[PDB]
Symmetry: D2
Subunit: 141 residues, 4 copies
């Protein structure tokens, strides 16, 4: 699939290249029910005007990763998954290189899954973390 997102359906409303994720270059590497990773090359498109990766870019990468990792498991069960809360804290800026995210599932309830995402720079330094709660609900179609 585009950006290596889970392929859970034959078509999607928006093609990868046209989505925010495609635009900024997010790509999923590993994907398992309890852990997933993704990364993105830093370019100006990922930065704010001050020159460092935009705080929203870390939120977004976390959001896509944690939601899609949930989607990978729940879609075939007839459920949809969507972000309900995204709490990202920023410890160190990233000027360039990549941002690498690792999502670890820490709770999988019937209505809410929760994932902790660490976002690191190319030296391995923890630049941000995001705690994501993902709502899971039966699909409407």
């Amino acid at each position: 699939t585009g950006g290596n997102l889970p392929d859970v359906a034959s078509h999607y409303p928006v093609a990868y290249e046209q989505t925010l994720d495609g635009t900024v270059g997010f790509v999923i590497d590993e994907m398992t029910p309890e852990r997933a990773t993704a990364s993105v090359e830093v370019t100006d498109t990922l930065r704010a005007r001050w020159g460092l990766v935009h705080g929203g870019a870390y939120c977004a990468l976390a959001e896509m990763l944690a939601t899609e990792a949930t989607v990978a498991v729940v879609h075939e069960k007839g459920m949809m998954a969507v972000g309900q809360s995204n709490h990202t804290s920023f410890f160190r800026p990233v000027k360039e290189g990549h941002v690498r995210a690792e999502a670890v599932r820490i709770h999988a309830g019937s209505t809410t899954w929760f994932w902790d995402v660490s976002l690191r720079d190319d030296a391995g330094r923890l630049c941000a973390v995001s705690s994501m709660s993902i709502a899971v609900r039966p699909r409407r179609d």
Copy 2:
């Protein structure tokens, strides 16, 4: 230039090349205690599922809260940067616009806090973001 606060003669990244300029964030009003901004929904703002990306609301909030702090503190020798962003999502947005309004609720010496509300074209509260902005002496 997205109408961001004109506080410096040079910025490392031009608006149009930033995440903000790429998705189309524009600031409407800005005062020390309250600031607004908006964006048209386009595919660039969406996830593959066709609804606005959760990261878009976070990003809009982050830019608005931070730049509304920059607008005040930059001329004081300070830099402003997001330290925590908590966004909660109540209703999706499929198309139209997202409109953010940031209300300053605390301005301490090292931290400012803004509540951001993100509404759809019908005025419905689709998401909120509680933004903590660190304020530190600018580096030489």
Copy 3:
């Protein structure tokens, strides 16, 4: 009811005076579907060893207020309400006096209600805020 909590049932598992809320002295003042207030006199029981109100005391007052305000509306509809996320940020310490909390409902969905709680000191200063998400689910009994 004890602490003026909503009286939605004829009995409760734990008497007010014996609960955490009773122990520290939380009391609800106003209670409406979209807004509720409560307050507590600061005594050592509310403080940490350093002498200021414990961060947990603000979390707890917010939690009781936002959950009970939801309970007041949903109990008779056959639902239970319980805290799902409590995010409290601390802006100014409180040494003594009272802490006064005001809870404003900002979203009432079918599964989650969300309340913003402001916690102020006797001078009116905003000492903390809490964003609370309250899960609402059908009661089991």
Copy 4:
């Protein structure tokens, strides 16, 4: 004295009179990067509905994260205080104990961040708390 870090000769409030001593919080292990604490469930820890109070998990996390920062920074002339506490609740606890484990994930000059996991007697993760601790020069 709940076995809190013995960093000062006098504290404004004795353990037994604090919120912590009233509900019975006790610290078990403490190192610069990791600390544990626990509490017996009693009615004092509960809401009227019979389950542990959400505020109890928050309080336990707040004390543990803060005091684990105090333990390091106090002798350096710094004070430590909670700046943000985000607790998410996954499973209730009706009785037994709550056991908290705090893991330091960032120690910056002005902010330390701890992840706290709160488990029941069966080891099940009942709640988590992401704690931000401000660190500032102690006032004279």
